[PDB]
């Protein structure tokens, strides 16, 4: 769907530019064989009960959502991905959702941003 003007991930508010930057960043990264901290990761889901995608069929990818993006981490300079992520349609770059570990029931769990 169209990138929202802003999104609230457990207190961290990101703009449409932060979101777009994450997706564009991830696509460029993949195109050049640079996968910072091994992201993007595949998003395996439609079975998900608390995450609603606003995009079509998979495959779906997930990449860290951060300020002054896009997220980047290097061989000798580790940078934490933080708790927030963007999910996009792998083959098209279509925005699907913003999710976060913040406010989830377990450390590895996710909830949708508002």
Swiss-Prot record:
Disulphide connectivity of cysteines: 1-54, 9-113, 55-96
Site label Methylation inactivates enzyme, positions: 62
Binding site for Ca(2+) 1: 29-30, 32, 37
Annotated positions binding Ca(2+) 2: 29, 31-32, 39
Source superkingdom: Eukaryota
Binding site for substrate: 39-49, 85, 108-110
Keywords from the UniProt entry: Calcium, Disulfide bond, Endonuclease, Hydrolase, Lyase, Metal-binding, Nuclease
One example GO MF annotation: metal ion binding
Coiled-coil region list: none
EC number(s) stated in the UniProt entry for this protein: 4.6.1.20
Enzyme class: lyase
Entries under InterPro entries matching the protein: N1-like, Ribonuclease/ribotoxin, Ribonuclease_N1/T1
Transmembrane segments: none
Reaction(s) this enzyme catalyzes, per UniProt: [RNA] containing adenosine + H2O = an [RNA fragment]-3'-adenosine-3'-phosphate + a 5'-hydroxy-ribonucleotide-3'-[RNA fragment]; [RNA] containing guanosine + H2O = an [RNA fragment]-3'-guanosine-3'-phosphate + a 5'-hydroxy-ribonucleotide-3'-[RNA fragment]
Pfam families: Ribonuclease
Active site per database record: 41, 62, 101
UniProt record similarity statement: Belongs to the ribonuclease U2 family.
UniProt-listed PANTHER family: EXTRACELLULAR GUANYL-SPECIFIC RIBONUCLEASE RNTA (AFU_ORTHOLOGUE AFUA_4G03230)
Protein name: Ribonuclease U2
Taxonomic placement: Eukaryota, Fungi, Dikarya, Basidiomycota, Ustilaginomycotina
